[PDB]
Amino acid sequence: YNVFPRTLKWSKMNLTYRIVNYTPDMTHSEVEKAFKKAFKVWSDVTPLNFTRLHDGIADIMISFGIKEHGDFYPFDGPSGLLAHAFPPGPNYGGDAHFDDDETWTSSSKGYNLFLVAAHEFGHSLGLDHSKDPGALMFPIYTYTGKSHFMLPDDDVQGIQSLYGPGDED
Amino acid sequence: YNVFPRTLKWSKMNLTYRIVNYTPDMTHSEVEKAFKKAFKVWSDVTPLNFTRLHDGIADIMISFGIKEHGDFYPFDGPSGLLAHAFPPGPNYGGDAHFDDDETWTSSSKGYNLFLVAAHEFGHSLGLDHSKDPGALMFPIYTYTGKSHFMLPDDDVQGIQSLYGPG
Ligand SMILES: CCOC(=O)c1cc2cc(-c3cc(C(=O)NCc4ccc(C(=O)O)cc4)nn3C)ccc2[nH]1
Ligand SMILES: CCOC(=O)c1cc2cc(-c3cc(C(=O)NCc4ccc(C(=O)O)cc4)nn3C)ccc2[nH]1
Ligand SMILES: [Ca+2]
Numbered sequence: 001y002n003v004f005p006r007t008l009k010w011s012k013m014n015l016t017y018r019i020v021n022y023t024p025d026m027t028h029s030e031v032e033k034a035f036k037k038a039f040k041v042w043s044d045v046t047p048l049n050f051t052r053l054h055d056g057i058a059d060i061m062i063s064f065g066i067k068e069h070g071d072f073y074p075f076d077g078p079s080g081l082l083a084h085a086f087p088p089g090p091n092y093g094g095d096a097h098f099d100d101d102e103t104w105t106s107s108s109k110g111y112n113l114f115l116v117a118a119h120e121f122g123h124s125l126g127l128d129h130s131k132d133p134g135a136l137m138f139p140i141y142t143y144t145g146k147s148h149f150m151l152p153d154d155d156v157q158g159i160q161s162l163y164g165p166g167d168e169d
Numbered sequence: 170y171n172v173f174p175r176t177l178k179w180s181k182m183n184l185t186y187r188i189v190n191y192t193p194d195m196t197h198s199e200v201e202k203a204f205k206k207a208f209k210v211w212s213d214v215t216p217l218n219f220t221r222l223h224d225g226i227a228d229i230m231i232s233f234g235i236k237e238h239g240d241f242y243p244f245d246g247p248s249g250l251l252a253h254a255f256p257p258g259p260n261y262g263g264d265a266h267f268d269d270d271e272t273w274t275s276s277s278k279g280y281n282l283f284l285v286a287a288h289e290f291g292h293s294l295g296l297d298h299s300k301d302p303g304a305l306m307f308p309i310y311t312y313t314g315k316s317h318f319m320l321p322d323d324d325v326q327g328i329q330s331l332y333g334p335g
């Protein structure tokens with residue numbers, strides 16, 4: 001027999017993602033690079049592996065949309081809500097949606113896609129918001145201007161509580 | 170940090186359920202009997218008790234729907250998906266939906282509602298699918314043609330690991 005897990009998490013280490021469509025604001029290559037980096041933030045500290053699919057059904061379906069876009073959480077035009085993602089689960093579970101009424105960027109001019117994606121994929125993997133003001137899962141966007149991203153310890157502790165550390169070296 | 174905590178089991182032993190609507194395939198009486206029997210499967214071997222409400226909110230809301238039916242886990246017409254249920258908890262937790270594009274029956278002509286409900290209620294109570302091919306929670310529908318239902322030992326051990334014996 002089998003009982004459900006105590007927390008909302010993926011029961012496999014190999015996860016797939018698919019970029020279903022693209023924002024006007026950035027090149028396909030910029031978007032792919034931002035999401036690739038965002039996944040590596042989490043894979044670096046767990047045993048999770050992320051592989052991109054070009055079509056079909058992926059564990060984490062990523063899309064850009066506006067207003068009503070196929071769930072219970074319509075976006076709201078420019079400003080306000082920027083993106084959301086669903087916790088691990090069947091169907092839409094894991095999916096990440098970005099509001100294409102916002103301005104997305106590879107830099108600091110608008111919302112940096114890498115940073116927002118890194119946060120949202122935390123949700124896709126089973127992290128909720130943190131109360132630690134220095135955490136990536138702290139629900140307020142910031143951009144620090146420095147050149148090297150480091151996943152804050154609170155997020156490391158949270159994600160490893162779910163999946164373990166993978167290779168610690 | 171925060172994770173999304175799952176409710177492994179219901180915190181109370183007395184649960185309510187409501188049959189929100191009814192399939193065209195069976196009489197109201199047959200549907201009521203099927204669900205009552207499906208709950209009895211699990212109450213017979215645990216301290217769980219189930220009481221039916223006729224209106225308002227209940228712990229387990231039971232309904233029949235087709236295609237997109239209000240939770241964005243759409244059914245797919247005849248065949249394929251037959252039903253699904255949400256794990257224990259508040260809100261949608263515990264609820265069970267049956268695909269009304271399937272033919273439901275009190276006998277063998279189609280899918281036996283009692284059997285599929287008994288399986289789905291196992292999910293509503295916190296059981297996942299079993300790997301034991303003989304278990305009720307094994308993810309393949311069967312119908313043995315026998316008149317008496319017996320909960321397989323794997324499901325008995327599973328449900329009791331959560332709620333204990335009766
Ligand atoms: C609407 C959902 O958004 C959020 O809720 C949310 C986003 C976010 C981002 C940081 C954050 C920002 C930085 C940072 O600026 N790091 C410097 C850096 C390094 C490299 C790059 C690059 O390669 O592009 C960009 C920035 N770090 N954190 C932990 C912290 C908390 C956060 N919450
Ligand atoms: C959503 C898809 O559903 C499933 O995944 C699923 C259904 C199912 C049913 C049995 C099963 C069937 C019988 C059986 O036929 N029992 C005899 C019987 C006796 C009485 C009645 C009656 O009162 O109507 C019906 C049947 N037993 N088991 C353990 C075993 C595994 C199963 N998996
Ligand atoms: Ca917005």
Ligand SMILES: [Ca+2]
Nearest residue numbers: 059091092093
């Ligand atoms: Ca998904």
Ligand SMILES: [Ca+2]
Nearest residue numbers: 025100101102
């Ligand atoms: Ca845009």
Ligand SMILES: [Ca+2]
Nearest residue numbers: 228260261262
């Ligand atoms: Ca409920």
Ligand SMILES: [Ca+2]
Nearest residue numbers: 246247248250
């Ligand atoms: Ca179906």
Ligand SMILES: [Ca+2]
Nearest residue numbers: 194269271272
């Ligand atoms: Ca029907």
Ligand SMILES: [Zn+2]
Nearest residue numbers: 069071073097
């Ligand atoms: Zn959405």
Ligand SMILES: [Zn+2]
Nearest residue numbers: 119123129139
């Ligand atoms: Zn968030």
Ligand SMILES: [Zn+2]
Nearest residue numbers: 238240242266
């Ligand atoms: Zn449903």
Ligand SMILES: [Zn+2]
Nearest residue numbers: 288292298308
């Ligand atoms: Zn099932």
